[PDB]
Design a protein around this ligand. Structure first.
Ligand SMILES: OC[C@H]1O[C@@](CO)(O[C@H]2O[C@H](CO)[C@@H](O)[C@H](O)[C@H]2O)[C@@H](O)[C@@H]1O
Ligand SMILES: Nc1ccc2c(c1)S(=O)(=O)C=C2
Lengths: 141, 139
């Protein structure tokens, strides 16, 4: 698994849309709640993500939001290879349910769940969080 | 420290730009928000802390930071509250503004350009490489 590969996926909750980007090699995630899976929101999500991390390749579910010209033009501007149809929503929903009663709004609880996921030590006390893994995988010097 | 950030706001076309700068690297995160409110501030900070190791954020004096929701977000996330990379962002947004209809988009292009731009000749690093290098070194 190359360090520049992300998987993008969507999850629906309380009638709202959660776009999730998973850095495949570390398990690190980024997520936003969006009003609906349109091309403008997808392009915007991908542009932000690509500005924050080295994004070489995105694997998608090939939803209609990805075939939109807006999103193709975003990947092109940002130098992203878009790979439609190339194959933890359950995990993120579980964690959202554990913080859900501390947030007045879903979107807040989503960011709380992201924080928790990315900080969680994976595989024992000597292991590493997703956050530690991504920076270790990506640091070049 | 790897964990020190500075947050500032920029006003433009009647929208507000919240800019967080990672002080040791120059790396930026930015969002356009309809208005500089306590709720938008809290959400911005919560997103930042889930994405990078945020220990301390230095802020301007303003009321958005006094909010009880900001205080709750900070307490939950372990954040303690206490220019060159800023007017540079505004210059970049200018250079690319015509490439996009909405300000939001131009802002995110400019954050992309800033964080990927090699400083110096062959041998140089971008702000994005500095931050990951600083933080990986610290682990
Ligand atoms: O410019 C707002 C822009 O950001 C999105 C998510 O991609 O909205 C989320 O992030 C904003 C910035 O912090 C918040 O203001 C917003 O409340 C939050 O859902 C976009 O949907 C939106 O167009
Ligand atoms: N090359 C490289 C390494 C890390 C990072 C970037 C580039 S970035 O600037 O895109 C953000 C983090």
């Amino acid at each position: 698994s190359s360090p520049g590969i992300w998987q993008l996926d969507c999850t629906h909750l309380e009638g709202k849309v959660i776009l999730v980007a998973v850095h495949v090699a570390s398990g690190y995630i980024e997520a936003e709640v969006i009003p609906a899976e349109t091309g403008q929101e997808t392009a915007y999500f991908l542009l932000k993500l690509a500005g924050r991390w080295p994004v070489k390749t995105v694997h998608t579910d090939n939803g209609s939001n990805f075939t939109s010209t807006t999103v193709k033009a975003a990947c092109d501007w940002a130098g992203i290879k878009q790979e439609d149809g190339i194959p933890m929503n359950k995990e993120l929903k579980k964690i959202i349910g554990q913080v859900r009663d501390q947030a007045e709004h879903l979107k807040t609880a989503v960011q709380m769940a992201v924080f928790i996921h990315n900080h969680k030590r994976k595989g024992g006390i000597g292991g590493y969080s997703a956050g530690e893994r991504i920076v270790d995988i990506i640091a070049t010097d």
